[model samples]
Target: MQYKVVINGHTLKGESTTEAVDAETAEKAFKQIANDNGVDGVWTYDDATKTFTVTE
Candidate 1:
């Protein structure tokens, strides 16, 4: 199931829908949040470092 997570700022809140555990979960999470916050579409995965990126 996908959980609804919220990113709250001083006067703004962003909504994101994501699955907690998956290969591309972070991408999906960040995409939802960033899109709500008016960010460009981009994603990066670290094969060596084994990390996911979150953009805002």
Candidate 2:
């Protein structure tokens, strides 16, 4: 799976080196990173699309 950071429902500039094997683990990692950096958002995964999205 791949994870990306989004702002106002749009992806951030450039790209990230974020990845995980499963959505649950990916969400957990995203949550930790968001919390550590004072980011306000939610982690979401789409199995059909095979995308991990972070909305802030």
Candidate 3:
């Protein structure tokens, strides 16, 4: 499955390339991305669409 990671915040802002990954793997990547950029956000995964969105 492919997941799209979108981040909108003060320090980090943009979208990531569609990554071929599972839900668990995707969340791991999401957390690292947010932490590395010093941004706090909410992550929601949609099984139907196979996408994870991070909103700030």
Candidate 4:
């Protein structure tokens, strides 16, 4: 599947257009990525635009 993905200030690296199994897959996966990076709960997912951005 294809999802236009973007997460700011993540430990993984720069913003991206991710190719994942699903959109939810992309979001949940990045949540784990952020958590592992100790930056969890700081991102808000906007389904309207299918994007994830820093909340604080």
* Best by the TM-score measure: 3
Give each model a TM-score. 0.42, 0.50, 0.69, 0.52
Against the hidden true structure, what lDDT does model 2 obtain?
Answer: 0.56
Model 4 spans with C-alpha error above 4 angstroms: 1-17
- Candidate rank order under lDDT: 3, 4, 2, 1
Q: How badly does each model clash, as a count of residue pairs?
A: 0, 0, 0, 0
Query: 9-45 in candidate 1: lDDT tens per residue?
Result: 4344555555566546655666666666665533455
Error of 4 at 31 (Å): 0.5
Candidate 2 vs candidate 4: which has greater TM-score? 4
Indicate which candidate wins on lDDT.
3
Between candidates 1 and 2, the one scoring higher on TM-score is 2
TM-score of 1: 0.42
Structure candidate 4, residue pairs in collision: none
1-56: candidate 3 lDDT, tens digit per residue: 67767787766678764565567887787778778888787777777876667777
Off by over 4 Å in 1: 1-19, 48-50, 54-56
Quote the lDDT for 40 in model 4: 44
Candidate number with the higher TM-score (3 or 4): 3
In candidate 1, position 7 carries an lDDT of: 45
